[PDB]
Design an enzyme around this catalytic site. Sequence first.
Site, PDB file in Angstrom:
ATOM      1  N   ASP B  25       0.796  -1.241   0.000  1.00 26.62           N
ATOM      2  CA  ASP B  25       0.000   0.000   0.000  1.00 26.62           C
ATOM      3  C   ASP B  25       0.807   1.258   0.000  1.00 26.62           C
ATOM      4  O   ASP B  25       1.236   1.718   1.076  1.00 26.62           O
ATOM      5  CB  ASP B  25      -0.917  -0.070   1.253  1.00 26.62           C
ATOM      6  CG  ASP B  25      -1.971   1.014   1.231  1.00 26.62           C
ATOM      7  OD1 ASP B  25      -1.910   1.892   0.314  1.00 26.62           O
ATOM      8  OD2 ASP B  25      -2.852   0.985   2.108  1.00 26.62           O
ATOM      9  N   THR B  26       1.043   1.864  -1.170  1.00 22.25           N
ATOM     10  CA  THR B  26       1.869   3.064  -1.239  1.00 22.25           C
ATOM     11  C   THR B  26       1.157   4.243  -0.597  1.00 22.25           C
ATOM     12  O   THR B  26       1.847   5.231  -0.300  1.00 22.25           O
ATOM     13  CB  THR B  26       2.224   3.419  -2.702  1.00 22.25           C
ATOM     14  OG1 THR B  26       1.032   3.599  -3.466  1.00 22.25           O
ATOM     15  CG2 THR B  26       3.051   2.269  -3.285  1.00 22.25           C
ATOM     16  N   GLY B  27      -0.145   4.152  -0.352  1.00 19.46           N
ATOM     17  CA  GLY B  27      -0.863   5.230   0.328  1.00 19.46           C
ATOM     18  C   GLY B  27      -0.843   5.127   1.844  1.00 19.46           C
ATOM     19  O   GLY B  27      -1.438   5.971   2.548  1.00 19.46           O
TER      20      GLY B  27
HETATM   21  C1  LIG Z   1      -7.021   1.011   4.078  1.00 24.88           C
HETATM   22  C2  LIG Z   1      -6.918   0.600   2.607  1.00 24.88           C
HETATM   23  C3  LIG Z   1      -7.220  -0.902   2.433  1.00 24.88           C
HETATM   24  C4  LIG Z   1      -7.846   1.457   1.732  1.00 24.88           C
HETATM   25  N1  LIG Z   1      -7.491   2.852   1.754  1.00 24.88           N
HETATM   26  C5  LIG Z   1      -6.392   3.369   0.976  1.00 24.88           C
HETATM   27  C6  LIG Z   1      -5.167   3.630   1.839  1.00 24.88           C
HETATM   28  O1  LIG Z   1      -3.964   3.702   1.051  1.00 24.88           O
HETATM   29  C7  LIG Z   1      -5.262   4.852   2.762  1.00 24.88           C
HETATM   30  C8  LIG Z   1      -5.183   6.163   1.970  1.00 24.88           C
HETATM   31  C9  LIG Z   1      -5.324   7.391   2.864  1.00 24.88           C
HETATM   32  C10 LIG Z   1      -4.195   8.200   3.055  1.00 24.88           C
HETATM   33  C11 LIG Z   1      -4.258   9.312   3.868  1.00 24.88           C
HETATM   34  C12 LIG Z   1      -5.440   9.643   4.533  1.00 24.88           C
HETATM   35  C13 LIG Z   1      -6.572   8.871   4.312  1.00 24.88           C
HETATM   36  C14 LIG Z   1      -6.525   7.735   3.496  1.00 24.88           C
HETATM   37  N2  LIG Z   1      -4.152   4.851   3.722  1.00 24.88           N
HETATM   38  C15 LIG Z   1      -4.267   4.633   5.040  1.00 24.88           C
HETATM   39  O2  LIG Z   1      -5.375   4.405   5.566  1.00 24.88           O
HETATM   40  O3  LIG Z   1      -3.082   4.707   5.698  1.00 24.88           O
HETATM   41  C16 LIG Z   1      -3.114   4.616   7.132  1.00 24.88           C
HETATM   42  C17 LIG Z   1      -1.923   3.761   7.564  1.00 24.88           C
HETATM   43  O4  LIG Z   1      -0.763   4.593   7.436  1.00 24.88           O
HETATM   44  C18 LIG Z   1      -1.172   5.930   7.700  1.00 24.88           C
HETATM   45  O5  LIG Z   1      -0.764   6.729   6.588  1.00 24.88           O
HETATM   46  C19 LIG Z   1      -1.865   7.348   5.924  1.00 24.88           C
HETATM   47  C20 LIG Z   1      -2.995   7.195   6.919  1.00 24.88           C
HETATM   48  F1  LIG Z   1      -4.210   7.105   6.332  1.00 24.88           F
HETATM   49  F2  LIG Z   1      -2.991   8.301   7.707  1.00 24.88           F
HETATM   50  C21 LIG Z   1      -2.681   5.969   7.738  1.00 24.88           C
HETATM   51  S1  LIG Z   1      -8.748   3.893   1.881  1.00 24.88           S
HETATM   52  O6  LIG Z   1      -8.294   5.270   1.821  1.00 24.88           O
HETATM   53  O7  LIG Z   1      -9.479   3.480   3.088  1.00 24.88           O
HETATM   54  C22 LIG Z   1      -9.790   3.585   0.486  1.00 24.88           C
HETATM   55  C23 LIG Z   1     -10.775   2.616   0.579  1.00 24.88           C
HETATM   56  C24 LIG Z   1     -11.626   2.326  -0.484  1.00 24.88           C
HETATM   57  C25 LIG Z   1     -11.472   3.046  -1.669  1.00 24.88           C
HETATM   58  N3  LIG Z   1     -12.264   2.801  -2.717  1.00 24.88           N
HETATM   59  C26 LIG Z   1     -10.458   3.993  -1.750  1.00 24.88           C
HETATM   60  C27 LIG Z   1      -9.606   4.293  -0.703  1.00 24.88           C
END
Ligand SMILES: CC(C)CN(C[C@@H](O)[C@H](Cc1ccccc1)NC(=O)O[C@H]1CO[C@H]2OCC(F)(F)[C@H]21)S(=O)(=O)c1ccc(N)cc1
EC number: 3.4.23.16
Lengths: 99, 99
Positions: B25-27
Amino acid sequence: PQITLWKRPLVTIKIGGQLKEALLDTGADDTVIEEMSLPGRWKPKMIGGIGGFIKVRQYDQIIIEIAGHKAIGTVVVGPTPVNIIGRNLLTQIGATLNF
Amino acid sequence: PQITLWKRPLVTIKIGGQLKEALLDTGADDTVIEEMSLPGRWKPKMIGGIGGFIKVRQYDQIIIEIAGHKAIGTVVVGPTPVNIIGRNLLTQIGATLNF
Ligand SMILES: CC(C)CN(C[C@@H](O)[C@H](Cc1ccccc1)NC(=O)O[C@H]1CO[C@H]2OCC(F)(F)[C@H]21)S(=O)(=O)c1ccc(N)cc1
Ligand SMILES: [Cl-]
Ligand SMILES: [Cl-]
Ligand SMILES: [Cl-]
Ligand code: NA
């Protein structure tokens, strides 16, 4: 380009005539953008997340330019804390993970 | 390998001698794993995403293998919908995003 992951992989996108910052996110199925208006029809959807769900509006056949690369697909709009480019548009610009 | 994004980038990981599935997960800044037993002391952390934040337990210097690649680093445990390999460990296994 080749983007390392020491920092968040943020890029400039153009969507709806507007420039925005967005995260290239291989863990997102969907592209999710903060509140903005887009043309055409939409329908409501819920998207999951690490903490639960948000309500979004789903717009189909939206063009986005992602770091200079055009792609078309579904974009959902709602109270996301970050603009996210998900797999549905990363595939179209030929993005891969490599190691 | 070179991983395309037409499907979720799921791989096998090994942590505590157990195989699990996880998403590259690059996000994600952080690696977040579903409830399990890890050794040592933990520290508190909050991580935030779509739908709000979750409280996690942060364990440092954990041995984890990711798609056959050895890493040692921070893993946080909490009620995440899927196991997530974030950038702190993607950088250890050499992963980049390419387009
Ligand atoms: C959890 C994952 C299976 C799905 N997510 C994408 C992620 O990449 C999300 C993308 C995301 C990034 C930033 C804010 C909100 C969401 N990152 C994330 O939740 O990271 C968490 C863990 O490390 C931290 O760094 C970022 C964080 F969030 F803070 C924490 S998501 O944002 O919930 C998502 C879910 C469903 C759809 N369709 C689109 C996006
Ligand atoms: Cl699409
Ligand atoms: Cl391809
Ligand atoms: Cl780490
Ligand atoms: Na449309």
